[PDB]
Each structure stands twice: as structure tokens, then as C-alpha cells.
Design an enzyme around this catalytic site. Structure first.
Site, mmCIF file in Angstrom:
data_model
loop_
_atom_site.group_PDB
_atom_site.id
_atom_site.type_symbol
_atom_site.label_atom_id
_atom_site.label_comp_id
_atom_site.label_asym_id
_atom_site.label_seq_id
_atom_site.Cartn_x
_atom_site.Cartn_y
_atom_site.Cartn_z
ATOM 1 N N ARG A 297 0.842 -1.189 0.000
ATOM 2 C CA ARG A 297 0.000 0.000 0.000
ATOM 3 C C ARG A 297 0.881 1.245 0.000
ATOM 4 N NH1 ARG A 297 -1.690 2.480 4.499
ATOM 5 N NH2 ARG A 297 -1.132 0.614 5.701
ATOM 6 N N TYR B 164 -2.086 -4.057 -6.160
ATOM 7 C CA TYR B 164 -1.817 -4.729 -4.895
ATOM 8 C C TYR B 164 -2.826 -4.298 -3.838
ATOM 9 C CZ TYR B 164 1.022 -7.317 -1.549
ATOM 10 O OH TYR B 164 1.479 -8.249 -0.642
ATOM 11 N N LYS C 70 -9.587 -0.506 2.148
ATOM 12 C CA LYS C 70 -9.161 0.743 2.771
ATOM 13 C C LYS C 70 -9.912 1.932 2.184
ATOM 14 C CE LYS C 70 -6.293 -1.517 5.248
ATOM 15 N NZ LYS C 70 -6.656 -1.766 6.667
ATOM 16 N N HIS D 197 -10.502 1.214 12.175
ATOM 17 C CA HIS D 197 -9.476 0.231 11.835
ATOM 18 C C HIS D 197 -9.302 -0.750 12.998
ATOM 19 C CE1 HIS D 197 -5.046 -0.536 10.436
ATOM 20 N NE2 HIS D 197 -5.855 -1.533 10.126
ATOM 21 N N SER E 194 -1.118 -1.567 11.385
ATOM 22 C CA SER E 194 -0.889 -2.727 10.534
ATOM 23 C C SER E 194 0.341 -3.495 10.996
ATOM 24 C CB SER E 194 -0.721 -2.300 9.075
ATOM 25 O OG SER E 194 -1.928 -1.779 8.541
ATOM 26 N N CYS F 155 0.638 -5.304 13.599
ATOM 27 C CA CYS F 155 0.810 -5.138 15.035
ATOM 28 C C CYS F 155 -0.026 -6.101 15.866
ATOM 29 C CB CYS F 155 0.498 -3.696 15.447
ATOM 30 S SG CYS F 155 1.810 -2.528 15.027
ATOM 31 N N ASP G 233 -10.011 -6.423 10.809
ATOM 32 C CA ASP G 233 -9.421 -5.229 10.211
ATOM 33 C C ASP G 233 -10.333 -4.007 10.201
ATOM 34 O OD1 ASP G 233 -7.103 -4.073 8.799
ATOM 35 O OD2 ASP G 233 -8.486 -3.930 7.106
ATOM 36 N N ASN H 15 5.574 -8.076 3.150
ATOM 37 C CA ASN H 15 4.162 -7.736 3.050
ATOM 38 C C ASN H 15 3.364 -8.759 2.250
ATOM 39 O OD1 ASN H 15 1.976 -5.972 3.675
ATOM 40 N ND2 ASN H 15 2.088 -5.089 1.613
ATOM 41 N N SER H 16 3.970 -9.893 1.889
ATOM 42 C CA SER H 16 3.234 -10.935 1.188
ATOM 43 C C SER H 16 1.983 -11.299 1.975
ATOM 44 C CB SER H 16 4.113 -12.170 0.977
ATOM 45 O OG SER H 16 4.491 -12.752 2.212
ATOM 46 N N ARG H 17 0.957 -11.754 1.261
ATOM 47 C CA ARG H 17 -0.377 -11.849 1.830
ATOM 48 C C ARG H 17 -1.022 -13.185 1.494
ATOM 49 N NH1 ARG H 17 -2.322 -7.400 5.248
ATOM 50 N NH2 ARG H 17 -0.542 -5.977 5.024
HETATM 51 N N1 LIG Z 1 5.429 -10.440 20.000
HETATM 52 C C1 LIG Z 1 4.223 -10.622 19.408
HETATM 53 N N2 LIG Z 1 4.161 -10.557 18.057
HETATM 54 C C2 LIG Z 1 2.990 -10.728 17.405
HETATM 55 C C3 LIG Z 1 1.774 -10.989 18.188
HETATM 56 N N3 LIG Z 1 0.767 -11.119 17.303
HETATM 57 C C4 LIG Z 1 1.294 -10.954 16.062
HETATM 58 N N4 LIG Z 1 2.621 -10.725 16.124
HETATM 59 C C5 LIG Z 1 3.521 -10.501 14.967
HETATM 60 O O1 LIG Z 1 3.026 -9.423 14.170
HETATM 61 C C6 LIG Z 1 3.036 -9.766 12.784
HETATM 62 C C7 LIG Z 1 1.719 -9.338 12.154
HETATM 63 O O2 LIG Z 1 0.638 -9.630 13.040
HETATM 64 P P1 LIG Z 1 -0.868 -9.535 12.481
HETATM 65 O O3 LIG Z 1 -1.857 -10.239 13.380
HETATM 66 O O4 LIG Z 1 -0.940 -10.108 11.085
HETATM 67 O O5 LIG Z 1 -1.094 -7.936 12.464
HETATM 68 P P2 LIG Z 1 -2.364 -7.229 11.766
HETATM 69 O O6 LIG Z 1 -1.889 -6.552 10.504
HETATM 70 O O7 LIG Z 1 -2.931 -6.199 12.716
HETATM 71 O O8 LIG Z 1 -3.443 -8.231 11.441
HETATM 72 C C8 LIG Z 1 3.239 -11.270 12.684
HETATM 73 O O9 LIG Z 1 4.343 -11.553 11.819
HETATM 74 C C9 LIG Z 1 3.540 -11.747 14.091
HETATM 75 O O10 LIG Z 1 4.824 -12.381 14.137
HETATM 76 C C10 LIG Z 1 1.919 -11.046 19.661
HETATM 77 O O11 LIG Z 1 0.928 -11.264 20.394
HETATM 78 N N5 LIG Z 1 3.140 -10.858 20.178
HETATM 79 MN MN LIG Z 2 -4.411 -8.430 9.133
HETATM 80 MN MN LIG Z 3 -5.515 -2.967 8.219
#
Ligand SMILES: Nc1nc2c(ncn2[C@@H]2O[C@H](COP(=O)(O)OP(=O)(O)O)[C@@H](O)[C@H]2O)c(=O)[nH]1
Ligand SMILES: [Mn+2]
Ligand SMILES: [Mn+2]
Ligand SMILES: [Mn+2]
EC number: 4.1.1.32
Length: 620
Positions: free
Chosen positions: A85, A233, A242, A262, A284, A286, A309, A401-403
Site C-alpha cells: 500500500r 496490490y 481501505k 481500523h 498494521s 501489530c 481489520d 508484506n506478502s499476503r
Molecule cells: N510479540 C508478538 N508478536 C505478534 C503478536 N501477534 C502478532 N505478532 C507478529 O506481528 C506480525 C503481524 O501480526 P498480524 O496479526 O498479522 O497484524 P495485523 O496486521 O494487525 O493483522 C506477525 O508476523 C507476528 O509475528 C503477539 O501477540 N506478540
Molecule cells: Mn491483518
Molecule cells: Mn488494516
């Protein structure tokens, strides 16, 4: 009527009938047909057959590969330049700039990128004229949220990319039934083109049509139009995600009185049979997805996933805050998804799932960093760059950022009400980001106003969601910095106004930090499934349990309030340390940020919370 044969594109319709299109729908199609000059016009009906011929076409064009190891799963490698993005090329067009972003006191606004209609008309005219020459124009009719659902809005995406149509079939509710529901109602106009009309004057890398130089993602809320060009993408091409579900929707919600946020939505049940619905707003990459599909470690606890999301919320007649996931699938990051982290994700993506830029195994499977899974003897890996890849190179086999793009229904813990048109009553709201230091594992807001201030004060380190790089901590209030549909000050005011509604059952507001580190760089909290221990405390606070300790930043768990059994070795001292030295600098940065970015549109109540917090910290 016409004088020749240059306005009726019926002879180019390879599936569907312009006659069967609603009045304004046909005009929107033929108008851009005449502008873009597509060789064919394809009116999607959402059928399995359509999806079938569509995939086969993409496979005959070298667009996507079939993952023979799984059930109806496909790989798609994009151009290395078009792999995420683009936050810097996203713009909102309003007559008045103040409608979009607060006028910064000094410097450039970080809460949006505004562009006049005059500047856009130039840029637009320099892109779309004849951009689909020799390509098919797919007409994607899709509903955001359950059909007939009150907070359900309908959009029409025009696109020259079969990869987009297939993905939109997963992420939204797409097909002919959407056309009939719409009737003559209003809809969101969405226009997308990869920007590579034929003959191709620029060779295609990985058979991925894209135009990085001319990339532009524009939003026109006054016109209800979304115009994206040069990218295929996710965020850029899936306009209902978004662009629609947050930016345009946030503007609408402000107008109509609801909220577009979000946020993940998860339901949680305790051993006593009581179930509550929470919502979390994280930046994102996180943790939203890993949290919304958590596999909890506390016995007698059940987590179910409504969404990961986007949340559309509104108080109902009874005063409850109701939320729905307007999406129809999950578009989550690939790397780090292992059986030990997000096993519910693994169970979902094993069929009917489209992958992008992940590695392929010689036996027809997927691979990415952190998949935490040994491969059999004699199994090779092809990276996302379409090259023989070995674990000895520095080149990661799966792009950061692969999905994966998977249907929501296949999730094994999908909540039995994620498609309920009435929504789920949200009793809690969670904020958080990646704070390596200072921020405690979790605390509770002292009041709604303090809550709103907490969201607005969110900060997090740079991840791999937009084009940001390096290890730097930046502001991301409400996790919505890249998606604000209008002035952020008016956003904050909109939130505070919820405390004025009659019989408003305002949910509690928490701030979590999964990512606090020690002096060695070691995470102080296992997280993932263990985050159910933090949710347990939140659940009790919602029921009114004397488990909280008052502190200068908010309520935190009392001594022995957090179920830590099965750990013991967790450093609780540093995990909750509230250093005055750290928080005196934090307020300064939040103050300087809010004074500059929100400036004269900052609500006073937010300034009062800032003042109050600065005071309580100086009394330490
Ligand atoms: N330390 C830690 N890392 C996390 C946790 N949850 C996710 N991650 C890391 O954050 C990255 C993305 O998390 P994701 O759930 O896909 O974030 P989203 O974009 O908000 O959905 C992943 O590669 C995980 O390794 C957590 O509870 N603790
Ligand atoms: Mn996600
Ligand atoms: Mn998002
Ligand atoms: Mn007030």
C-alpha cells in the site's frame, strides 16, 4: 441516442447485459468504457463458474500458479515495485483543504494528503484516457457488510485486472444478487486500472501489469468516487477495503452518526458461560489478526472471530454500541503465521485461498519466514522473486508484506454472528502498538474523554505495512493515520460526542502493549495465545471487579490480579514499570504533535486530558 456507433458498448459485452443494469449503473460503466476504451466489458455475476473461468484465464496468462498441494489455492507473484500500500500516493480531494486535514501550525500534515479538484483533473486526464486499450473491463458489484444490513453499503468497482476480481470475490459480497439489492439506490463509484494498455510499451515483470511512476489512489467523498491507477496490490486495488471501508466510510459515518474504524472484532466467552464482544485498533502488522483468531491458553475460555481489520459501529435504540465486519474474508500478512502463533489461520488458508508473493515449495505448497515448519527431504523452495531460493541467502523467500486472501466463512472460530445484520454489542475497545519501552502491558482509561485521548496519543514503531522503513516511533492515533476520511480534529470531536448520546452504554477503553522489551532486546511477554490472560482481566473489569490499581496513566491490574500461572519467570517489575522520566518525555512529544497537527481543530477536552496527564505525571 447517438448519431453514429461510438457510445453503445453493448457489442463489447462478453458476459451480462447493459440493459439489465440499473440506470445510474449503466451510465457509470459506459462513461468510463468510452474514456478507458476497453476491448471487452465483463459484468461479474459472482458465480462459481465465473470464478472458474477467471482462474483458468489467469493461469493461461501466466498471472497466477496453482498450488497443487492444497484445495483450490493459487500463488501470484507481483512486480517488486508494486508490493504494498502506497501511503504517499494516496490523496483526498475536497474543495476546502480543512475538510480533509487540520491545517498544521507549522510543517506538513501527517493526517492525510489533500489535493484540489483542479490538480486532480490534470493528474486524472494524464492517466485514464485509453488506459484499458485491448483489455477487459470487469464490472464488480459488491456489498460491504451483509446484504440488506442497515450499515451495509454497495459499491461498483470497474477494473481491468482479473486478479482484482478474484480477490474482491473473496473479500466482499460480489455478484448479481448485489445488483438486484441495489436497485436504484446510491452506490460508491470505484475505478481501477493497472495502467498498462496494450500494446505493452513497458515489459512486465512477473507478468504483473503495473505503472509505479503514475501510481495514484484518489478519494472524492463529495462525489462518492474512488479512483486508483497504476497499482494492483491489495490496498490500492481492492477499493472496497481501505479506500471505501475506512476513508470514504469514515466521512459518511461522521455525516450519518456512526463510526468506521481500523479495528478487529472478537467475541470472548468465560468458563461461567458469559460472552462479551471486544474491539481492538492496532496499526498494521501489530497483531490484530493473531488476536482476532487467538488460540487461548486459559482453559474454559473461547475466542471467536467476527473480523480482523474493519469495524462499522453505531449505537442502537437500546444505547448499545453495535459493530459489524463489513468484509467477507481475511487479507492478512503471511510471514510469522505458524502453527504455534496463529493455528486458526493455518486451518483457514488450506483451501479456496489466494496467496501473493509467498514462496512455493517444489511439492506444491507455500512457504514464508516464521512458518516454523520443517520440509521433507528433497523439497525445494522458489522465492517470491521467482528464483531458486536456499536458506543460506539473505534474500527472504517470502516478501515481508506478502499476503493470503481467504474466505472468512472457512475460519474454524468464525463467530456465529459475524454476518448477523444487527451487529455484535461491543463492551470494550482496545488500543495499542509496538512500544519497545515505557508503555506497560495494559492499563484502563479513567473515563471516555481520557480514552479518546489515549487513542489519539497512540504511537508505534515502523513496521512493513506502508512504505515506512527503519526503527522509528511515529504517531498513529486510533491506528487510522493512513485512513482518515476527513479532518482529524473533527474526528476526535466526533468520538467525544458519543458521550453525549442518551442512555449511551460507552464501552471501557484499554491500552495494551504486546511488544515491550528489556535492556537486552528480549520481549517481556510471550503474547499470542497468552494474551488471553490480559483479556481475562479486561473481562472482569467490564463486569466491575476490584482488580485495578490507580496510576498516573490509568488503571492497571492489582498485585496478583493477572492470572500468571504457568509462567512464573515473567519479569513483572519491568513489564509494568511506570518511569516518570519516560512519561515526562512522552507528554512533550504528544503535546508537540497535537499542537502542530491538530492545531486549531483540537477539541479542548483532549487538551484538558493532555493537561491532566502532564499534571499527574509531574506529581510522581
Ligand atoms: N510479540 C508478538 N508478536 C505478534 C503478536 N501477534 C502478532 N505478532 C507478529 O506481528 C506480525 C503481524 O501480526 P498480524 O496479526 O498479522 O497484524 P495485523 O496486521 O494487525 O493483522 C506477525 O508476523 C507476528 O509475528 C503477539 O501477540 N506478540
Ligand atoms: Mn491483518
Ligand atoms: Mn488494516
Ligand atoms: Mn464532552
Amino acid at each position: 441516442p447517438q448519431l453514429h456507433n461510438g457510445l453503445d458498448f453493448s457489442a463489447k459485452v462478453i458476459q451480462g447485459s447493459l440493459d439489465s443494469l440499473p440506470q445510474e449503473v449503466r451510465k457509470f460503466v459506459e462513461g468510463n468504457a468510452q474514456l478507458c476504451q476497453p476491448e471487452y466489458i465483463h459484468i461479474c455475476d459472482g458465480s462459481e463458474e465465473e470464478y472458474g473461468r477467471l482462474l483458468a484465464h489467469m493461469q493461461e496468462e501466466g498471472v497466477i500458479r496453482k498450488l497443487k498441494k492444497y484445495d483450490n489455492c493459487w500463488l501470484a507473484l507481483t512486480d517488486p515495485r508494486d508490493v504494498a500500500r502506497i501511503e504517499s500516493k494516496t490523496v483526498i480531494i475536497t474543495q476546502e483543504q480543512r475538510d480533509t486535514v487540520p491545517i498544521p501550525k507549522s510543517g506538513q500534515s501527517q493526517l492525510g494528503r489533500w489535493m484540489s479538484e483542479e490538480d486532480f483533473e490534470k493528474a486524472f486526464n494524464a492517466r485514464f484516457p485509453g488506459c484499458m486499450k485491448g483489455r477487459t473491463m470487469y464490472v464488480i458489484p459488491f456489498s460491504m457488510g451483509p446484504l440488506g444490513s442497515p450499515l451495509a453499503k454497495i459499491g461498483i468497482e470497474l477494473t481491468d485486472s482479473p486478479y482484482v476480481v478474484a480477490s474482491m470475490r473473496i473479500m466482499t459480497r460480489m455478484g448479481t444478487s448485489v445488483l438486484e439489492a441495489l436497485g436504484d439506490g446510491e452506490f460508491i463509484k470505484c475505478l481501477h486500472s493497472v495502467g498498462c494498455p496494450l500494446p505493452l510499451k513497458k515489459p512486465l515483470v512477473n507478468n504483473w501489469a503495473c505503472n509505479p511512476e503514475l501510481t495514484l489512489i484518489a478519494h472524492l467523498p463529495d462525489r462518492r468516487e474512488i479512483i486508483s491507477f497504476g497499482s494492483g496490490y491489495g490496498g490500492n486495488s481492492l477499493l472496497g477495503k481501505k479506500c471505501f471501508a475506512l476513508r470514504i466510510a469514515s466521512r459518511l459515518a461522521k455525516e450519518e452518526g456512526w463510526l468506521a474504524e481500523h479495528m478487529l472484532i472478537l467475541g470472548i466467552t468465560n468458563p461461567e458461560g458469559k460472552k462479551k464482544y471486544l474491539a481492538a485498533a492496532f496499526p498494521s502488522a501489530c497483531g490484530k489478526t493473531n488476536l482476532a483468531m487467538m488460540n487461548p491458553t486459559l482453559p474454559g475460555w473461547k475466542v471467536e472471530c467476527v473480523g480482523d481489520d474493519i469495524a462499522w459501529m453505531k449505537f442502537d435504540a437500546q444505547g448499545n454500541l453495535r459493530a459489524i465486519n463489513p468484509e467477507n474474508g481475511f487479507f492478512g500478512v503471511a510471514p510469522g503465521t505458524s502453527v504455534k502463533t496463529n493455528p486458526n489461520a493455518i486451518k483457514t488458508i488450506q483451501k479456496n485461498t489466494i496467496f501473493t508473493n509467498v514462496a512455493e515449495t517444489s511439492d506444491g505448497g507455500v512457504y514464508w519466514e516464521g512458518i516454523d515448519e520443517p520440509l521433507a527431504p528433497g523439497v525445494t523452495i522458489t522465492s517470491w522473486k521467482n528464483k531458486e531460493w536456499r536458506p543460506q541467502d539473505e534474500e527472504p523467500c517470502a516478501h515481508p508484506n506478502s499476503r493470503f486472501c481467504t474466505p472468512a466463512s472457512q475460519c474454524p472460530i468464525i463467530d456465529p454472528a459475524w454476518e448477523s445484520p444487527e451487529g455484535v454489542p461491543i463492551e470494550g475497545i482496545i488500543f495499542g502498538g509496538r512500544r519497545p519501552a515505557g508503555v506497560p502491558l495494559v492499563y484502563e482509561a479513567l473515563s471516555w474523554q481520557h480514552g479518546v485521548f489515549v487513542g489519539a496519543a497512540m504511537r508505534s514503531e515502523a513496521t512493513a505495512a506502508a512504505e515506512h522503513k527503519g526503527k522509528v516511533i511515529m504517531h498513529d492515533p486510533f491506528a487510522m493515520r493512513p485512513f482518515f476520511g476527513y479532518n482529524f480534529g473533527k474526528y476526535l470531536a466526533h468520538w467525544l460526542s458519543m458521550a453525549h448520546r442518551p442512555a449511551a452504554k460507552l464501552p471501557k477503553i484499554f491500552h495494551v502493549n504486546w511488544f515491550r522489551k528489556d535492556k537486552n532486546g528480549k520481549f517481556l511477554w510471550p503474547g499470542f495465545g497468552e494474551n488471553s490472560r490480559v483479556l481475562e482481566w479486561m473481562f472482569g473489569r467490564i463486569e466491575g471487579e476490584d482488580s485495578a490499581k490507580l496510576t498516573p496513566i490509568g488503571y492497571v491490574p492489582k498485585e496478583d490480579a493477572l492470572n500468571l500461572k504457568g509462567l512464573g519467570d515473567v519479569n513483572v517489575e519491568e513489564l509494568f514499570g511506570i518511569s516518570k522520566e519516560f512519561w515526562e518525555k512522552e507528554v512533550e512529544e504528544i503535546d508537540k504533535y497535537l499542537e502542530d497537527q491538530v492545531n486549531a481543530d483540537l477539541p479542548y477536552e483532549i487538551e484538558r486530558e493532555l493537561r491532566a496527564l502532564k499534571q499527574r505525571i509531574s506529581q510522581m
